[PDB]
Amino acid sequence: GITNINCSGHIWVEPATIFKMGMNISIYCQAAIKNCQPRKLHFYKNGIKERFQITRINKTTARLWYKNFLEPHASMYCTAECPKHFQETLICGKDISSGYPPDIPDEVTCVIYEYSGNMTCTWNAGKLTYIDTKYVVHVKSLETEEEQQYLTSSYINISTDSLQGGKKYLVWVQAANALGMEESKQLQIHLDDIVIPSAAVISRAETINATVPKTIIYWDSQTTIEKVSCEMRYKATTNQTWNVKEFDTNFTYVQQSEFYLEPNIKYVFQVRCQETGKRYWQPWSSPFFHKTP
Amino acid sequence: PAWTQCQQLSQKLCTLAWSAHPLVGHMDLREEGDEEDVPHIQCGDGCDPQGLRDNSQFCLQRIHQGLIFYEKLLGSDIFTGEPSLLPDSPVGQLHASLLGLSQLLQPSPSQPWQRLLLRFKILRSLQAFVAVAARVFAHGAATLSPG
Amino acid sequence: SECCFQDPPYPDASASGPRDLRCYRISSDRYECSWQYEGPTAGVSHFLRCCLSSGRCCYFAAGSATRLQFSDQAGVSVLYTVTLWVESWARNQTEKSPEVTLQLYNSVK
Amino acid sequence: VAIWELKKDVYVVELDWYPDAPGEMVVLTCDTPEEDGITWTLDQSSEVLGSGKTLTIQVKEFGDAGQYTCHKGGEVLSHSLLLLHKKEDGIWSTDILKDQKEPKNKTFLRCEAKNYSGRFTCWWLTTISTDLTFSVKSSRGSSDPQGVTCGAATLSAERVRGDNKEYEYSVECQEDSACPAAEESLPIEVMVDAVHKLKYENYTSSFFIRDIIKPDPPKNLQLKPLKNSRQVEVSWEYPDTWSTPHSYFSLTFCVQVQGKSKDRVFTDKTSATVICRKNASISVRAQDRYYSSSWSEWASVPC
Ligand SMILES: *[C@@H]1O[C@H](CO)[C@@H](O[C@@H]2O[C@H](CO)[C@@H](O[C@@H]3O[C@H](CO)[C@@H](O)[C@H](O)[C@@H]3O)[C@H](O)[C@H]2NC(C)=O)[C@H](O)[C@H]1NC(C)=O
Ligand SMILES: *[C@@H]1O[C@H](CO)[C@@H](O[C@@H]2O[C@H](CO)[C@@H](O)[C@H](O)[C@H]2NC(C)=O)[C@H](O)[C@H]1NC(C)=O
Ligand SMILES: *[C@@H]1O[C@H](CO)[C@@H](O)[C@H](O)[C@H]1NC(C)=O
Ligand SMILES: *[C@@H]1O[C@H](CO)[C@@H](O)[C@H](O)[C@H]1NC(C)=O
Ligand SMILES: *[C@@H]1O[C@H](CO)[C@@H](O)[C@H](O)[C@H]1NC(C)=O
Ligand SMILES: *[C@@H]1O[C@H](CO)[C@@H](O)[C@H](O)[C@H]1NC(C)=O
Ligand SMILES: *[C@@H]1O[C@H](CO)[C@@H](O)[C@H](O)[C@H]1NC(C)=O
């Protein structure tokens, strides 16, 4: 009628309506008009009539062929010229998609930002998929052997409240789209070893005019974790090497690092911290510049 | 009076309707649904020049029903889903101009490829409706407005 | 042009005469017949004769022309085999072309 | 496939056309109440094979068609005219009419309307002049059709093409109860039957009145100078054949300057200002203002 399409025939695609990008494809259109043997058969891509690579193989069926189809989406529909009509007769249409099968997800990592209360699991998804690819995250307890699954489109936050059965778990990721499906290797975690303390930030940078110029660096974090190791990098912007110092800091008070440096040069400063001995670190803080007197 | 605002906005509508879809008649395809529901300006709906001099209330009752009917479609998923219709696109302005003009009178599933063909069908059927609507407003502002 | 089914105005009977009769289908329902004549064309009248499947035979008065067209309702059948030849009456006796017989419909070229 | 009656004692027989066809055997019956020695005579034909109340001849060529007559006892009882409808590989024959190519391919029937009044004129072309007969009937809608009265098909024009003459036929039609202001929902259906000698064909065309509207050229086109900058004020009027009133059936115009070599402006008003040049001509078209139908023809004046 007016609010719906009434197909008068059907259309199909080889190899399939969803195919690997860059492949040759053939689109077949078979008409089914009551009292009309079609004079000609047209194809439209995104409302644009196609003029090439169309062959009248059958009096009622037509084939459109594309070499190296690169569009990720395309709306196809075909029509028929009927002698008793001044209008083109709609046959049927179909949306075709192109993409790639998903890679085997690797670099699976699960961490718990301290006060976030939920565990953030990420991974490397691999090649571009272009098509709707869904990800299933499996979580299994090394103790009670019970397995939970979680669906997502990007990454996921899993609440620690749902992690009741033990503190040792196995985590792997399944990636799936129309063209394929792959699975990652199992990653085991210990909920005590995958915690990352709250962000550590640099406050100021003061230089003292005394015997030797001291560049005091003020930085602090709001973490309840006790055993914490940190690292700080400092380089002259003209230079291209990184100098680093290690500290086992106590965040009860704001930290003060005393550096003996050279005057009248630009500098850069970054910090990252971890629970001592644990596997994961913080990301490097945003670069903090400071010219000396 | 109020007839001038309805005349100016309807003038913009006929511009926006054809501007949204400049396809010619032979381009329009047809499908096996020959049999007939959609509100049309029927014969004797009081929208002829004599009908407005006798009583303009009858013609506006049908035009009001049509403007909210086609507005219901520009708000449907047909005109909002994939492929996305741009809001500032000339098709998007038609929606607000339809609701605004409708206010002055009296104070479902679909797949992305079907929407292209459906959108074509609605706009053409709308164009014939906006045409006769802009005629009664032009006649009203030129005859009943000065009085 | 319409095929008259009576007899030609000369007696039925030399080496000189027309030759190489070729007929094809020029349109969806119109046809054309071309031939050539060996000799002077002064006073020569050509007549294209055709015989149907029932045995009835007709003729076209071509006049001095060496090319004749006709529709599918002139009396000549096109879906079945017919017999064609050109007869020319210049002086003394009648002259004929080689015989050509075929189904006219499938002559599209 | 089947056979059908065109009018009184006139029949059309559908024939698949391919080489070496068997045709379709046809059973004809004389309209006689009682007879035991019926002979059959086709028009002039002296040779008479007809016998009995029913005669069956294998229709496989035009020669088997025509007016078949059965007269008993030296008195003519009735006649019977047989026409052929040529079907070729599933395609109905279209030899009588010519392809107009407008607006698209295979547009044998083309129709125009000078206004919304409900009067329209459909025309066609043909390459023959004799033994030709047309028959036009029309209505609005197919299910419950409304009344549409059509005149007679008549020769309107005769021109020359490459090697032959082209013949233009036309017919005038009027909707019995027309509603110009109404938004049309059911289309007009025009059906034309064509018979050339013994060959029958039929054509069709569907349209709304609003889509076939082509107004007549502008009326009373004149020019007048402007002393300030030697510009010209063009003035025209609405055509008489256009619908009334003009405050309801508005129009839009297009004004251009052409000077025997190689300028278009659009307006809704009935005048405009342009610039004239040497041996230049100003021309104006017309179109419905609120519906993009066909443009009018040009009305021109010299500078
Ligand atoms: C109406 O129908 C005719 C049918 O012939 C259309 O003619 C089309 O003409 C083009 C161009 O001649 C044909 O394609 C091209 O032919 C040229 C040689 O002429 C060649 O250079 C190209 O490689 C290609 O073959 C086309 O085949 C032909 N149509 C058909 C169905 O065969 C005409 O365009 C139609 N439209 C109008 C408005 O008349
Ligand atoms: C998982 O939780 C983290 C926090 O631990 C979320 O990170 C931030 O969330 C807020 C909204 O609550 C956003 O405004 C921020 O942009 C997020 N990022 C940062 C760096 O603060 C994170 O959004 C959660 N997961 C997902 C998929 O959203
Ligand atoms: C597509 O076909 C062409 C030749 O027909 C060939 O050269 C090309 O490699 C094919 N491409 C694919 C992806 O199969
Ligand atoms: C092709 O047409 C024939 C009819 O001759 C039909 O039987 C067949 O199914 C058609 N093939 C396709 C692929 O549509
Ligand atoms: C936990 O994950 C949810 C998921 O919506 C997120 O919104 C939230 O910021 C995360 N952290 C919390 C709740 O502390
Ligand atoms: C650049 O950094 C390296 C790494 O510590 C250091 O040895 C070198 O002295 C620096 N350059 C200068 C000019 O001090
Ligand atoms: C048109 O001609 C065909 C060919 O035989 C015939 O079957 C048909 O009935 C005619 N049209 C109508 C509407 O009857």
Q: Counting ligands in written order, which one lies closest to the CA of residue D104?
A: 1
Residue B12 pairs in a beta bridge with none
B17 to A52, A248, D282: CA distances (angstroms): 32, 71, 31
| Residues of chain D numbered 156-195 and touching chain B (CB < 8 Å) | 177, 179-185
Report yes or no: A83 at the D interface, CB cutoff 8 Å: yes
- Among D200, D98, D64, D92, residue whose Cα is nearest residue C79: D64
> Which of A146, A172, A197 represents a domain boundary (last residue)?
A197
Assess whether the previous peptide bond of D103 is cis (omega < 30° from 0): yes
- Token readout for A131 is 């098509």
| CA distance linking residue D52 with residue B104, whole number of Å | 81
The dihedral through the CA atoms of A46, A47, A53, A57 has a sign that is positive
Phi, psi of A199 (to 5 degrees): -60, 140
| CA distance linking residue A282 with residue A231, whole number of Å | 10
The dihedral through the CA atoms of B20, B26, B29, B35 has a sign that is positive
Report yes or no: A85 at the D interface, CB cutoff 8 Å: yes
Give the length of chain D.
303
Q: Decide: A256 and A232 in contact? Cβ < 8 Å.
A: no
Contact state of A85 with D205 under an 8 Å Cβ cutoff: no
Residue B50's H or E segment, with its range, is helix B49-54
- Token readout for A174 is 């399944």
Report yes or no: B88 at the A interface, CB cutoff 8 Å: no
- E strands within D127-250? 132-140, 146-150, 154-160, 165-175, 188-196, 199-207, 219-226, 231-237
Contact state of D106 with A83 under an 8 Å Cβ cutoff: yes
Amino acid at D50: G
Contact state of A86 with D207 under an 8 Å Cβ cutoff: yes
- E strands within chain C? 17-25, 30-38, 45-51, 57-63, 67-71, 82-89, 94-96, 100-102
Other CB atoms within 10 A of residue D285 CB: 20
The dihedral through the CA atoms of B52, B55, B59, B61 has a sign that is positive
Q: What's the CATH superfamily of C17-107? A: Immunoglobulins (2.60.40.10)
- Token readout for B38 is 């959609």
Q: Which of D95, D127, D128, D163 should one mutate to test binding to chain C, selecting the residue with the greatest count of C CBs within 10 A?
A: D95
User: Regarding beta strands A118-124 and A106-113, do their DSSP bridges make them parallel or antiparallel, or are they unpaired?
Assistant: antiparallel
Technique behind this structure?
X-ray
Same-domain check for residues A193 and A204: no
Give me ligand 5 centre to Cα D9, in Å: 88
Residues of D in contact with A80 (CB under 8 A): none
Residue A136 pairs in a beta bridge with A151, A174
| CB-nearest partner of D20 from C28, C72, C79 | C79
> Which of A47, A70, A101 represents a domain boundary (last residue)?
A101
Environment class of D143 (CB within 10 Å of its CB; exposed 0-12, middle 13-18, buried 19+): exposed
Give me ligand 7 centre to Cα D202, in Å: 7
B12: left (phi over 0), alpha (psi -120 to 50) or beta: alpha
- Among D287, D275, D281, residue whose Cα is nearest residue D262: D281
Please give the resolution of this entry in Å, rounded to 1 decimal: 3.4
Mutate to test the pocket of ligand 4, among A37, A60, A78 (most ligand atoms within 8 A of CB): A60
Environment class of D113 (CB within 10 Å of its CB; exposed 0-12, middle 13-18, buried 19+): buried
How many CA atoms lie less than 13 Å away from D87 in the CB half-sphere?
12
- Among A31, A88, A23, A36, residue whose Cα is nearest residue A57: A31
Q: Decide: D296 and D218 in contact? Cβ < 8 Å.
A: yes
- Token readout for B82 is 């994939």
Q: Decide: D107 and D61 in contact? Cβ < 8 Å.
A: no
Q: Is A5 close to ligand 3, i.e. is its CB under 6 Å away? A: no
- Reduced to 3 states, what is the DSSP secondary structure of residue C76? coil
Contact state of B44 with D180 under an 8 Å Cβ cutoff: no
| CA distance linking residue D93 with residue D292, whole number of Å | 34
- Token readout for A45 is 């891509």
* Domain extent at residue A43: 1-101
- Token readout for A39 is 């004079």
Residue D20 pairs in a beta bridge with none
Other CB atoms within 10 A of residue A231 CB: 16
Amino acid at D132: L
Closest-CA residue of chain A to B120: A47
The dihedral through the CA atoms of B23, B26, B27, B33 has a sign that is positive
Residue A218 pairs in a beta bridge with A204, A256
Domain total in chain B:
1
Contact state of D290 with B134 under an 8 Å Cβ cutoff: yes
Ligand 7 neighbours, Cβ below 6 Å, are D 4, 14, 85, 92, 202
Residue A83: partners with Cβ closer than 8 Å, 6 or more residues away: A36, A39, D91, D92, D106
Chains D and A touch, using 3 or more CB pairs below 8 Å: yes
- Among C56, C50, C41, C49, residue whose Cα is nearest residue C89: C41
Residue D175 pairs in a beta bridge with D148
| CB-nearest partner of D290 from B36, B51, B131 | B131
Residue A149 pairs in a beta bridge with A138
Contact state of C79 with D199 under an 8 Å Cβ cutoff: no
The dihedral through the CA atoms of A221, A225, A226, A232 has a sign that is negative
Q: Decide: D133 and D201 in contact? Cβ < 8 Å.
A: no
- Token readout for D273 is 């200002």
Report yes or no: A58 at the D interface, CB cutoff 8 Å: no
Q: Please give the angle made by the CA atoms of B69, B73 and B76, to the nearest 5 degrees.
A: 135
Q: Could you identify the atom of ligand 1 that is nearest to the CA of residue D106?
A: 1
- Among C99, C101, C109, C45, residue whose Cα is nearest residue C77: C101
Assess whether the previous peptide bond of B83 is cis (omega < 30° from 0): yes
- Reduced to 3 states, what is the DSSP secondary structure of residue B53? helix
| CA distance linking residue A48 with residue A283, whole number of Å | 50
- Among A234, A253, A236, A254, residue whose Cα is nearest residue A244: A234
- Token readout for A158 is 């899993």
> Which of A176, A197, A218 represents a domain boundary (last residue)?
A197
Residue where the block lists tokens 């043909």: D126
| CA distance linking residue A71 with residue A45, whole number of Å | 11
Give the length of chain A.
293
Phi, psi of D246 (to 5 degrees): -80, -15
Closest-CA residue of chain C to D21: C79
| Residues of chain B numbered 24-63 and touching chain A (CB < 8 Å) | 26, 28-33, 36-38
Domain total in chain A:
3
D133 to A249, D29, D96, D150, D276: CA distances (angstroms): 108, 26, 10, 15, 52
Residues of D in contact with A39 (CB under 8 A): 91, 106
Residues of A in contact with D92 (CB under 8 A): 83
A219 to A70, A213, A214, A273, D62: CA distances (angstroms): 51, 19, 16, 12, 107
> Nearest-CA distance from D205 to chain A in Å?
7
| CA distance linking residue A129 with residue A125, whole number of Å | 9
Give me ligand 3 centre to Cα A179, in Å: 20
Amino acid at B125: S
Q: Could you identify the atom of ligand 6 that is nearest to the CA of residue A235?
A: 2
| CA distance linking residue A191 with residue A160, whole number of Å | 9
Assess whether the previous peptide bond of D215 is cis (omega < 30° from 0): no
